[PDB]
Amino acid sequence: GANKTVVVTTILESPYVMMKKNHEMLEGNERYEGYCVDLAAEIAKHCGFKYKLTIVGDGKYGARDADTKIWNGMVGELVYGKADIAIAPLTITLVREEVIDFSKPFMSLGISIMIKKGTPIESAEDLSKQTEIAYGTLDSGSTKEFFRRSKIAVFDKMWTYMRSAEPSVFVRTTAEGVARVRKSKGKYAYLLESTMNEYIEQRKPCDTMKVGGNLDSKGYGIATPKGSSLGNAVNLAVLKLSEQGLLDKLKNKWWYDKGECGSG
Amino acid sequence: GANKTVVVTTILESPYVMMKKNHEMLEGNERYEGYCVDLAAEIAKHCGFKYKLTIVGDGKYGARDADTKIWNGMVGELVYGKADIAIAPLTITLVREEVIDFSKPFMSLGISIMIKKGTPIESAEDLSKQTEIAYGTLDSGSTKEFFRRSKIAVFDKMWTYMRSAEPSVFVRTTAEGVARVRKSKGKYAYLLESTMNEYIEQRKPCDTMKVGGNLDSKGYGIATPKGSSLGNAVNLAVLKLSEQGLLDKLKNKWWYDKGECGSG
Numbered sequence: 001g002a003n004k005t006v007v008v009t010t011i012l013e014s015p016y017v018m019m020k021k022n023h024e025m026l027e028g029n030e031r032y033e034g035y036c037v038d039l040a041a042e043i044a045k046h047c048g049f050k051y052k053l054t055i056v057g058d059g060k061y062g063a064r065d066a067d068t069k070i071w072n073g074m075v076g077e078l079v080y081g082k083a084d085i086a087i088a089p090l091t092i093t094l095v096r097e098e099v100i101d102f103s104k105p106f107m108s109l110g111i112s113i114m115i116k117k118g119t120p121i122e123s124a125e126d127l128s129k130q131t132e133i134a135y136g137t138l139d140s141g142s143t144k145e146f147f148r149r150s151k152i153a154v155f156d157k158m159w160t161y162m163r164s165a166e167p168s169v170f171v172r173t174t175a176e177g178v179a180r181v182r183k184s185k186g187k188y189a190y191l192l193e194s195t196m197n198e199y200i201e202q203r204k205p206c207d208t209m210k211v212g213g214n215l216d217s218k219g220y221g222i223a224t225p226k227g228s229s230l231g232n233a234v235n236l237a238v239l240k241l242s243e244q245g246l247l248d249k250l251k252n253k254w255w256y257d258k259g260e261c262g263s264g
Numbered sequence: 265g266a267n268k269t270v271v272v273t274t275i276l277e278s279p280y281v282m283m284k285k286n287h288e289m290l291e292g293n294e295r296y297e298g299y300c301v302d303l304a305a306e307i308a309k310h311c312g313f314k315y316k317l318t319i320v321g322d323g324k325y326g327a328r329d330a331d332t333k334i335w336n337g338m339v340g341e342l343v344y345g346k347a348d349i350a351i352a353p354l355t356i357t358l359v360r361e362e363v364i365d366f367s368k369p370f371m372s373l374g375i376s377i378m379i380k381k382g383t384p385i386e387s388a389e390d391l392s393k394q395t396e397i398a399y400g401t402l403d404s405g406s407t408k409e410f411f412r413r414s415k416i417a418v419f420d421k422m423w424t425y426m427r428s429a430e431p432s433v434f435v436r437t438t439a440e441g442v443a444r445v446r447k448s449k450g451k452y453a454y455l456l457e458s459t460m461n462e463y464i465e466q467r468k469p470c471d472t473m474k475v476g477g478n479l480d481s482k483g484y485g486i487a488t489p490k491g492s493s494l495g496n497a498v499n500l501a502v503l504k505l506s507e508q509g510l511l512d513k514l515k516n517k518w519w520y521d522k523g524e525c526g527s528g
């Protein structure tokens with residue numbers, strides 16, 4: 001690509017990055033809109049670099065293959081030198097922090113439960129103590145790894161069920177998990193991050209609900225290859241945007257409730 | 265060189281660090297108990313260092329004098345080489361990040377409003393639109409700087425009032441702010457971090473309340489002098505304790521398991 005241009009890896013995930021209406025006649029960064037598109041523009045302005053948004057080739061967030069030890073997803077693109085920075089809903093985790101750098105967080109989230117409205121589930125404990133309602137997570141992301149690694153009794157029990165459930169309770173994209181909730185007549189619940197849960201809850205057909213408290217507490221960060229010279233300025237830019245109120249403004253914009261569900 | 269005892273700066277702020285019963289016949293770290301005492305022990309165990317807890321001499325979190333540019337508080341202890349690490353409810357901020365290192369956050373908070381029960385205030389906007397009820401913040405901390413720096417109309421209006429109010433609406437310790445709320449018959453409201461607010465709400469005589477949403481969203485981090493080699497291990501330890509659920513257990517221990525205002 002062009003010299004001095006920062007390659008940004010990101011992922012198609014609403015409302016963080018979405019294809020604009022009529023994107024097929026657009027070019028470059030103008031094809032895309034969303035929270036992370038606006039955030040990328042703000043970060044680049046404060047840090048003084050030009051950049052190219054690139055959608056992660058395999059469509060994944062990032063997991064390490066237990067056998068090959070190879071990273072996939074956006075994490076892999078950073079580790080193996082395909083991208084200079086990830087600006088995406090990429091969760092800060094211990095295993096990732098060991099291999100890439102993360103800015104201070106720009107958005108809070110926790111794992112949460114999505115049900116079809118009326119499902120008799122109020123908590124993770126509820127899910128773990130029954131079998132009529134199946135439940136699962138996104139593949140190749142931090143939610144699945146959380147359950148795989150957890151020694152907390154309820155979550156360990158949930159993982160033991162999910163890992164062996166047939167047919168697979170895992171999905172390839174957030175959209176597939178939501179569709180499965182909507183089409184399973186209450187017999188599937190989807191474990192996903194509270195940010196995405198709350199976005200979908202305010203979208204037609206208004207048939208999903210977040211139930212219970214969040215299962216953990218963490219955040220998204222802007223990620224760079226370990227030791228990258230970009231890390232320092234990006235981190236200071238995140239904190240400046242936080243303190244100016246602009247991260248709150250951006251959340252309000254992209255989670256804006258136009259009233260598709262009820263009064264608004 | 266040889267391992268050396270790590271000097272930890274911290275602050276007497278309940279329930280983070282408190283004097284134990286019988287402290288008058290105890291020495292060293294055994295004088296103290298609290299959330300940050302337990303956290304210091306966990307971090308030290310995971311990182312393999314011995315340490316000495318030392319209460320910051322001036323009792324302050326940390327601000328930079330506009331004239332001398334000298335840092336006070338725990339931040340100053342780190343900047344000037346008096347302590348090796350700060351394990352305290354020390355808020356991550358841009359101006360502090362420029363001069364010290366912060367781990368990833370170990371606790372979330374936002375600025376919030378504390379009222380005496382029954383005070384006719386529900387929001388910061390409510391406070392800004394009246395004059396019968398005075399309000400202020402802690403000195404030498406991130407809350408006061410937030411109002412000083414805010415360009416948001418409501419918060420700017422609040423700062424313009426607070427900076428010139430007579431008598432002073434600012435307090436030197438959280439405890440003084442709590443006393444002023446409790447003794448002022450509903451005519452003082454205290455602006456403080458949601459963590460401290462929610463703790464006091466569970467303490468006798470159960471006469472205070474947190475009202476409204478939080479005004480911002482941030483966190484506390486473990487701080488080290490810029491470039492300190494201790495930072496890397498401490499950061500990984502925070503993320504491990506987070507993922508294991510131990511930070512959540514520690515918050516429940518010191519906020520709610522011991523609460524004095526019932527089981528609700």
Ligand SMILES: O=S1(=O)NCN(C2CC2)c2cc(CCc3ccc4c(c3)N(C3CC3)CNS4(=O)=O)ccc21
Nearest residue numbers: 104105106107108218219368369370371372482483
């Ligand atoms: O995975 S973590 O790193 N570790 C574990 N935890 C839990 C607390 C124990 C969290 C919790 C959060 C959300 C609270 C939070 C903390 C710090 C900041 C926040 C928001 N902001 C706000 C825009 C979101 C701005 N910058 S900031 O001042 O750094 C994020 C990341 C993590």
Ligand SMILES: N[C@@H](CCC(=O)O)C(=O)O
Nearest residue numbers: 061089090091141142143
């Ligand atoms: N934000 C997650 C993806 C979504 C999920 O796992 O629920 C990650 O960075 O892996």
Ligand SMILES: N[C@@H](CCC(=O)O)C(=O)O
Nearest residue numbers: 325353354355405406407
């Ligand atoms: N946590 C704050 C102190 C409390 C406050 O300012 O409300 C700081 O680090 O400065």
Ligand SMILES: [Cl-]
Nearest residue numbers: 020021022023
């Ligand atoms: Cl289109």
Ligand SMILES: [Cl-]
Nearest residue numbers: 151152153154
């Ligand atoms: Cl458990």
Ligand SMILES: [Cl-]
Nearest residue numbers: 313314315316
């Ligand atoms: Cl020790």
